[PDB]
Amino acid sequence: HHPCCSNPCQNRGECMSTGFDQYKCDCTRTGFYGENCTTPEFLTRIKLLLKPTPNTVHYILTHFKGVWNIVNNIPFLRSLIMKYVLTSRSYLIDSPPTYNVHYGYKSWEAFSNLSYYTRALPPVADDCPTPMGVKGNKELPDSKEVLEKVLLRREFIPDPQGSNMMFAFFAQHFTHQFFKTDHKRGPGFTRGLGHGVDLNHIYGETLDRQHKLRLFKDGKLKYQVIGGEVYPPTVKDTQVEMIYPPHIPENLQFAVGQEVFGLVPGLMMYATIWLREHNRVCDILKQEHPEWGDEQLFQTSRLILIGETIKIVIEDYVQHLSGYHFKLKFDPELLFNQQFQYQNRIASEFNTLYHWHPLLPDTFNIEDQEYSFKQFLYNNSILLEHGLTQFVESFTRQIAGRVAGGRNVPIAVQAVAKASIDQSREMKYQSLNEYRKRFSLKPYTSFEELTGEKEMAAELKALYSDIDVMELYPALLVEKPHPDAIFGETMVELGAPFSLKGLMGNPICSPQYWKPSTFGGEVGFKIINTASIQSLICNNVKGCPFTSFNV
Amino acid sequence: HHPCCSNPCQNRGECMSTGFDQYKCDCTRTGFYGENCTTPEFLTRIKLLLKPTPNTVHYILTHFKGVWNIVNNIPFLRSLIMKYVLTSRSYLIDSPPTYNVHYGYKSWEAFSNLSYYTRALPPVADDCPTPMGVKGNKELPDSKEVLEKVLLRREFIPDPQGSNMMFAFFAQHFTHQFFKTDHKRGPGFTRGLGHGVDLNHIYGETLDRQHKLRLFKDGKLKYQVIGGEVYPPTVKDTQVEMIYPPHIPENLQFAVGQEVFGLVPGLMMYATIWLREHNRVCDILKQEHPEWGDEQLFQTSRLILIGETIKIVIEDYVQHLSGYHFKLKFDPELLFNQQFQYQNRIASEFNTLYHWHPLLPDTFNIEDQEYSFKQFLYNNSILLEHGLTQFVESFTRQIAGRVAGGRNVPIAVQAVAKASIDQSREMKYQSLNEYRKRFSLKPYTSFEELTGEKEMAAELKALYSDIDVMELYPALLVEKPHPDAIFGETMVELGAPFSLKGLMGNPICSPQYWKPSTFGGEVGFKIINTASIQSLICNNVKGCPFTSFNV
Ligand code: COH
Ligand code: COH
Ligand SMILES: *[C@@H]1O[C@H](CO)[C@@H](O[C@@H]2O[C@H](CO)[C@@H](O[C@H]3O[C@H](CO)[C@@H](O)[C@H](O)[C@@H]3O)[C@H](O)[C@H]2NC(C)=O)[C@H](O)[C@H]1NC(C)=O
Ligand SMILES: *[C@@H]1O[C@H](CO)[C@@H](O[C@@H]2O[C@H](CO)[C@@H](O[C@H]3O[C@H](CO)[C@@H](O)[C@H](O)[C@@H]3O)[C@H](O)[C@H]2NC(C)=O)[C@H](O)[C@H]1NC(C)=O
Ligand SMILES: *[C@@H]1O[C@H](CO)[C@@H](O[C@H]2O[C@H](CO)[C@@H](O)[C@H](O)[C@H]2NC(C)=O)[C@H](O)[C@H]1NC(C)=O
Ligand SMILES: *[C@H]1O[C@@H](CO)[C@@H](O[C@@H]2O[C@H](CO)[C@@H](O)[C@H](O)[C@H]2NC(C)=O)[C@H](O)[C@H]1NC(C)=O
Ligand SMILES: CCCCC/C=C\C/C=C\C/C=C\C/C=C\CCCC(=O)OC[C@@H](O)CO
Ligand SMILES: CCCCC/C=C\C/C=C\C/C=C\C/C=C\CCCC(=O)OC[C@@H](O)CO
Ligand SMILES: CCCCCCCCO[C@@H]1O[C@H](CO)[C@@H](O)[C@H](O)[C@H]1O
Ligand SMILES: *[C@@H]1O[C@H](CO)[C@@H](O)[C@H](O)[C@H]1NC(C)=O
Ligand SMILES: *[C@@H]1O[C@H](CO)[C@@H](O)[C@H](O)[C@H]1NC(C)=O
Incomplete structure (x- = not known):
């Protein structure tokens, strides 16, 4: 078998076979040497004794609300801290990207082929003696058992951070511009060739789709007026392909940038809001x-909207997730004297860790009605009937589920949770502990440490035998959450760097783009710099309902 | 008409219309302000007063051989000098890229559509009152008149810098991996979607093409053996599309990565050499x-060959072109503590300036035959008849033509030169002086200053009237050359930043790729770091003949 199956190289060292039965570790720039890159250089010893634990940095940012209220009002200090927040993450992501599902070594194919999701860790080799390498049993536990024992929802567990349905649907809408798995090809392939925040979910992935969605007057997108309200145009009007079941009538087949957004009226809500925003920005320009x-x-409205999107994601969305008392800031200028790559490639593991289906409630509560999954799926009538204003008011009110802490996957999406496990396996993901080390975390020493509890830990011990072969995806869903938080440590430490990179990596954030002329002058620039989730709703939804991401 | 037609904004200010008859300049990070970005900031006055002229720097690098002799043998200094050389030429290129033929303002379409060549300067707006903006006559001069008066060769002018046919054909072979105009779409469109040094001219632009070219045994490329010599495989064996006239025999229809390489036995010479190199490296690995x-x-041999190419291009090819006494060095480590983007987009103007058709001799002198263009075109027989060894010996001793200095374009390719002019105009290129300002040179004040001579200057003055509307492409070919040099100032000052960007931008130069494991260990890495034009020929051509880029 492959001599690297056991993952012998530590500290970002690269493994390479040197004959049938031996390996060598490349320890270049790791700050370590030795056979396995485990012996620290002198400067590294000094960096490691003085480096705070990720959990210490987290504690500081989530406490001392009094000190942060001061910090948040000294622009120079706020800039300084946001600068640190941005750069401390940066070094963790390979950019230019490296591996993918087919390439556990660097290759021009893996670099140049945009149809692959990239990979933060190389796949386990095809001939390894165990699924994870060398440790553990010959087979991993049945995914149905992992799912039923520790993942599926018994009682609904609300998010203690107060995340609402505006948040859950925003997560879903936002991330579905860059997570667009190409099922024809396989789970390691993507249809999102822009690999980031390009708004293809509004404008379409291809020029042909964009042209069918565009009005070609005043920069605007096509729309229809129903009962005086602006909605997306239909499939028959545009000839734009959408996914709908057969039983969906022509008039309810709304056509938007992203093929799947008829699935959920929560997604159609955001699609409609952003469509109005684009046309509103056209009016101003x-x-x-x-x-x-x-x-x-x-084109100028698109760039403005891309900027709005990043602004909202950092200052409302990530801000809300973070639980930080520090006020995050979207400011491209903070990177101008730093080393940073203005490019991104979506990692498969980023897709995987973002399968936050535990956010979903048991029923969808709009006004006085309590719709089941059966009733809500593909039902845009619900949107037309209640209107955007009520959708916003209701979803702002309705709490979402906790993601970490275990046993919170709604039964309605059980098949989806099973697929995240199976497809992780099919894509040959390395273990949870391998991912933790890759992201500068200590490997978990037991299942009880992972969950912070006894019962689930025991189930997992019986299924996996060894903590070092625990899988990444279920681990994220059963991980001991931070105190009163939605997520645990692994989610935050893997997610945050993938997020920063995708947001700041965008070309609009580069010095040649980050100028008022790019956005049609100072007014367009200001639309970006003052954007918020509240203003997005206020500007585009009748009656300007109040909103946010917490209940 | 468009209020930016006169190009009012100086110093890399950006111009934007604010009404029908008004404009605004965006002076962000230019170091200037005022209406036209022409008033310098205090620190800018200083930077201006100190900074040496590009000509003064050229003089220092092409003189004091005694000093350079010391520097070149003192690694720490060589490295510091190369680091300057690399980072000064850097800030001149927009990266992430900006404009293209259809977009004179920044847009997501210009950012994301890889099918365009990018643009260093935006095009002249469609409705401008004159071809170059507001200066000059209503029509630029008949392009045949320009071609015939100042471009066409009367007598062959040899390159006083000593460039040979080995150099001339290397330039053509190398550049034709990234200059691959898609004539079906227009001159501002490329088929080279990798936008750099990916070696698609060897391996194919598509996976479909690569796979038909591959042996699938030992990593190797398919080949044939004729008279004991290894040549590329045929079109019939591989089913790889090549451009060939109907009449060419089955066996001389060589199939290589780049579809046009059967055009010229000079091209097929390098194609064969590089094919041999790839399979030789396979054997080593x-x-x-x-x-x-x-x-x-x-895949590993491919990455190795990419590195080989960059190494040769920097240390042999650019070295020769530069006339420098200083020894250029390929060393990615020199950028590791610098700000640099590992990405490239091929600029249209880089394609344009690289039309070095004056390089071409009147006949192609192999052994004791002197082949006319008519005889040499599409004649792979010549290659088989003489063999690679004689090709190398003959082309190493044959002088190429001078590029600048005027009147040296071979009549045989007059149509290509005319097309260079017409297509510049069709792509709405700004004038020579706008390009010189864009690259930090003073605009020429007369035609005689451009040519350094009287007679062509007068023909040009009669044809164009205003130096400020002189065109880029013909100017490059008529420009006063540097002393005893193949080129003039404008060629060097534009070409150099485009070059080094496309060389160092490659992902193999990034910290996460520049490691021995990337290339199969120390042995593959060493193939790259010891590569030379002499070693390429020595390893792959029978009898290891001497070669170099100069006679
Ligand atoms: C970010 C949070 C989030 C939320 C709130 C959410 C809300 C919902 C929801 C109710 C609104 C339903 C019925 C589903 C149902 C599904 N989700 Co999500 N999803 C979410 C994140 C994701 C992600 C990310 C994927 C992977 C998409 C991909 O790779 O194409 C996904 C995949 C799926 C799939 C497989 C899609 C396929 O292409 O086969 C289904 C089915 N789901 N989800
Ligand atoms: C760098 C030096 C160089 C040399 C030595 C050279 C040598 C020769 C040569 C010698 C046997 C012949 C017969 C030609 C003939 C042509 N070359 Co050049 N070319 C060169 C640089 C270029 C460049 C650059 C282009 C543009 C390529 C593109 O845009 O696709 C080009 C394009 C052409 C074209 C028109 C575009 C096309 O249809 O491909 C013709 C015809 N040629 N050339
Ligand atoms: C990026 O990588 C993709 C996956 O390798 C690749 O898709 C693959 O493309 C090949 C070649 O075009 C397809 O192979 C086809 O042709 C062979 C032999 O002629 C047939 O046996 C196959 O059935 C097939 O029709 C594959 O279908 C395809 N593999 C997939 C989708 O998994 C993309 O082409 C690559 N992208 C680029 C830009 O090169
Ligand atoms: C890259 O940018 C290219 C330049 O615009 C673009 O090429 C153009 O593609 C469009 C739409 O696919 C073609 O226009 C079409 O318009 C109607 C459809 O209703 C048809 O009647 C036409 O025949 C045609 O299909 C343009 O012809 C085409 N322009 C060209 C070839 O120069 C590329 O599609 C863009 N690439 C990507 C990936 O978006
Ligand atoms: C290098 O790292 C590897 C870790 O895999 C070590 O490999 C061996 O060490 C084990 C216990 O120390 C032995 O039981 C085995 O022979 C072997 N392990 C495996 C998985 O085969 C090796 O000791 C390390 N060497 C150094 C310098 O620490
Ligand atoms: C910088 O920009 C140019 C704009 O082109 C200059 O305007 C020119 O002023 C000339 C002198 O009065 C006029 O001959 C001419 O009308 C005008 N050029 C054009 C094409 O309109 C601005 O004055 C200058 N601005 C400043 C403040 O220096
Ligand atoms: C591909 C495009 C990328 C956009 C993706 C955007 C958002 C994804 C959000 C979260 C991923 C999961 C967890 C991290 C979130 C919050 C925890 C802390 C956030 C933080 O420290 O700043 C994080 C800071 O680094 C971000 O800038
Ligand atoms: C797209 C990938 C890029 C590969 C381009 C490779 C080769 C092109 C070679 C030279 C540049 C093009 C035209 C002439 C310009 C400069 C050459 C002369 C002097 C020089 O380069 O030195 C200037 C000094 O700075 C040394 O660099
Ligand atoms: C191979 C050149 C054919 C061009 C002939 C038509 C254009 C003539 O052009 C003339 O050529 C003369 C001789 O070089 C020059 O002295 C003149 O300045 C030039 O205008
Ligand atoms: C569609 O949703 C509507 C709300 O307008 C609901 O009344 C109806 O029962 C739903 N139809 C189906 C088939 O679920
Ligand atoms: C083909 O090139 C060969 C060289 O072997 C030569 O003898 C012959 O004359 C050439 N054919 C043409 C069409 O010039």
């Missing part, structure tokens, strides 16, 4: 530039 | 790694 044509209005 | 399969042998 046209007022500033009576001389501009359709094409420039469209 | 197979020896190192008996455990490796076909796929990893192939």
Whole structure:
């Protein structure tokens, strides 16, 4: 078998076979040497005794609300801290990207082929003696058993951080521009070739789709007016392909950038809001530039919207997730004297860790009604009937489920949770502990340490035998959450760097783009710099209902 | 008409219309302010007063051989000098890229559509009152008149810098991996979607093409053996599309990565050499790694050859072109503590300036035959008849033509030169002086200053009237050359930043790729770091003939 199956190289060292039965570790720039890159260089010894634990940094940012209220009001200090928040993560992500599902070594194929999700850790080799390498049993536990024992929801567990349905649907809508698995090819492949925040979920992935969605007047996107309300146009009107079941009538087949957004009325809500936003921004640009044509209005509105999106994601969305008392800041300028790559490639593991189906409630509560999954799925009538204003009011009110802590996957999506496990396996993911080490965390020494509890730990011990072969995805869902938090440590430490990279990596954040001229002058620039989840709703939803990501 | 037609914003200010008849310049990070970005900031006045002119720097690098002799043999200094050389040429290229033929403002479409060449300067707006903006006559001069008066060769002018046919054909072979105009779409479109040094001219642009070219045994490329000599495989064996006239015999229809390489036996000489190199490297890696399969042998040899190419281009090819006494060095480590983007997008103007058709001789002198263009085109027989050894010996001793200095484009390719002019105009290129300002040079004040001579200057003055509307492409070919040099200032000052960006931008130069494990261990890494034009020929051409880029 492959001599690297046991994952012998530590500290970001690279493993390579050197004959049938031997390996060598490449310890270049790891700050370690020795056979397995485990012997620290002198500067590394000094860096390691002085480096705070990820859990210490977390504690500082989630306590001392009094000190943070001061820090948050000294612009120079707020800049300084946000600068640290951005750069301390940066070094963890390979950019240019490296591995993928087919390439556990660097290759031009893995670098150049945009159809692959990239990989933060190389796949376990095909001929390893155990699924994870060398440790554990010949087979992993039945995924149905892992699912039923520790993942599935008994009683609904609300998120103690107060995440609402505005948040859950925003997560779903936002991330589905860059997580668009190409099932024809396999779970390690993506249809999102832009690999980030390009808003293809609004504008379409291909130019042909964009052109069918565009009005070609005033930069605007096509729309329809129903009962005086602006909604997306239909499939028959646009000829834009969407996924709908057969029983869905022509008039309820709304056409948006992303093929799957008819699935959920929560997604259609956001699609409608962003469509209105784009056309609202067109109206403003046209007022500033009576001389501009359709094409420039469209393109400039897209860049503004991309900027709005990143702004909202950092300052409301990540802000809410973080539980930080520190006020996060979207400011591209903070990277201008730093080493940073303005490019991104979506990692398979980022897709995997974002399968937050425990956010989903048992029923969807709009106004006085309590819709089941059966009733809610593919039902855009519900949207037309209640309207965006009520959708916003209801979803702002409705609490979402806790993601970590175990046993919170709604039964309605059990098949999806099973697939995340099976497809992790099919893609040959390395173990939870391997991922933890890759992200500068201590491997868990037992199942009780992972869960912080006894009962689930015991189930997991019986299923997996060895903590070092525990799988990444179920571990994220059963991990001991931070105190009163939605997630545990592994989710935060893997998610945050993938997030920073995808947000700041965007070309609009580079010095040649980050200028008022890029966005049609100072007014367009200000739309980006003052954007928020509240203003997005206020500007585009009748009556300007109040909103946020917490209940 | 568009209020930016006159190009009012200086110093890399960005121009934007604010009404029908008004503009605003965006002076962000230019170091200037005021209406047209022409007033310098205090620190800018200083930076201006100190900073040496590009010509003064060229003089220092092409003189004082005694000093350079010391520096070159003192590694720490060589390295510090190369680091300057690399980082000064850097800030000149927009990266992430910006404009293209259809987008004179920044847009997601220009960012993301890899099918365009990018643009260093945006195009002249469609409705401008003159071809170059507002200066000059309503029509630029007949392009045949320009071609015939100042471009066409009367008498062959040899390169006083000593460039040979080995150099001339290396330039053509190498550049044709990234200059691959998609004539079906237009001159501003490329088929080279990798946008750099990916070796698609050897391996194929598509996976479909690569796979038909591969042996699938030991990592190797398919080949044939004719008279005991290894040549590329045929079109019939591989089913790889090549451009060939109907009349060419089955066996001389060589199939290589780049579809046009059967055009010229000079091109097929290098194609064959590089094919041999790839399979030679396979052999070395197979020896190192008996455990490796076909796929990893192939991909690893590919990365090795990419490195080989960059190394040769920097240390042999650019070295020769530069006329420097200083010894350029390929060493990715020199950028590791610098700010640099590991990405490239091929610029249209880089394609344009690289039309070095004056390099071409009047006949192709092999052994004691002197082949006309008519005889040499598409004649792979010549290659088989003489063999690679004679090709190398003959092309090493044959002088190439001077590029700058005027009147040296061979009549045989007059149509290509005319097309360079017409296509510049079709892509709405700004004038020579706009390009010189864009690359930190003073605009020429007269035609005589451009040519350094009287007679062509007068023909040009009569044709164009204003130096400020002189065109880029013809200017490059008529420019006063540097002393005893093949090129003039504008060629060097534009070409150099485009070059080093595309060389160092490659992902193999990034910290996560620049490691021995990437190339199969120390042995593969060493193939790269010891590569030379002489070693390429020595390892792959029978009899190991002497070669170099100069006669
Ligand atoms: C971010 C949180 C989030 C939420 C709130 C959410 C809400 C919901 C929801 C009710 C609104 C339903 C019925 C589903 C149902 C599904 N989800 Co999600 N999903 C979420 C994150 C994801 C992600 C990420 C994927 C992977 C998408 C991909 O790779 O294409 C996913 C995949 C799926 C799949 C497999 C899709 C396929 O292409 O086969 C189904 C089915 N689901 N989900
Ligand atoms: C770098 C030096 C160089 C040399 C030595 C060279 C040598 C020769 C040569 C010698 C046997 C011949 C017969 C030609 C003939 C042509 N070359 Co060049 N070319 C060169 C640089 C270029 C470049 C750059 C282009 C543009 C390529 C593109 O845009 O695809 C080009 C394009 C062409 C074209 C038109 C575009 C096309 O259809 O491909 C013709 C015809 N040629 N060339
Ligand atoms: C990026 O990698 C993708 C996966 O390797 C690749 O898709 C694959 O493309 C190949 C070649 O075009 C397809 O192979 C086809 O042709 C062979 C032999 O001629 C047939 O036996 C196959 O049935 C098939 O029709 C594969 O279908 C395809 N593999 C997949 C999708 O898993 C992409 O082409 C690559 N992208 C780029 C830009 O190169
Ligand atoms: C890369 O940018 C390219 C330049 O615009 C683009 O090429 C263009 O593609 C469009 C749409 O696919 C073609 O226009 C079509 O318009 C109607 C459809 O209703 C048809 O009647 C036309 O025949 C045509 O299909 C343009 O012809 C085409 N322009 C060209 C070839 O120069 C690429 O598609 C863009 N690439 C990506 C990945 O978005
Ligand atoms: C190098 O790291 C590897 C870790 O896999 C070590 O490999 C061996 O060490 C084990 C216990 O120390 C032995 O039982 C085995 O022979 C072997 N393990 C495996 C998985 O085969 C090796 O000791 C390390 N060497 C150094 C320098 O620490
Ligand atoms: C910088 O920009 C140019 C704009 O082109 C200059 O305007 C020019 O002023 C000239 C002198 O009065 C006029 O001859 C001419 O009308 C005008 N050029 C054009 C094409 O309109 C601005 O004055 C200058 N601005 C400043 C403040 O220096
Ligand atoms: C591919 C495009 C990327 C966009 C993805 C956007 C958001 C994904 C959000 C979260 C992933 C999971 C967990 C991390 C979230 C919050 C914890 C702390 C956040 C933090 O420290 O700043 C995080 C800071 O680094 C971010 O800038
Ligand atoms: C797209 C991938 C990039 C590969 C391009 C490779 C080769 C092109 C070679 C030279 C640049 C093009 C035209 C001439 C410009 C400069 C050459 C002369 C002097 C020089 O380069 O030195 C200037 C000094 O700075 C040394 O660099
Ligand atoms: C191979 C060149 C054919 C061009 C002939 C038509 C254009 C003539 O052009 C003329 O050529 C003369 C001789 O070089 C020069 O002295 C003149 O300045 C030039 O205008
Ligand atoms: C569709 O949703 C609507 C709400 O407008 C609901 O009344 C109806 O029962 C749903 N239909 C189905 C088939 O679930
Ligand atoms: C083909 O090249 C060969 C060299 O072997 C030569 O003898 C012959 O004349 C050439 N054919 C043409 C069409 O010039």
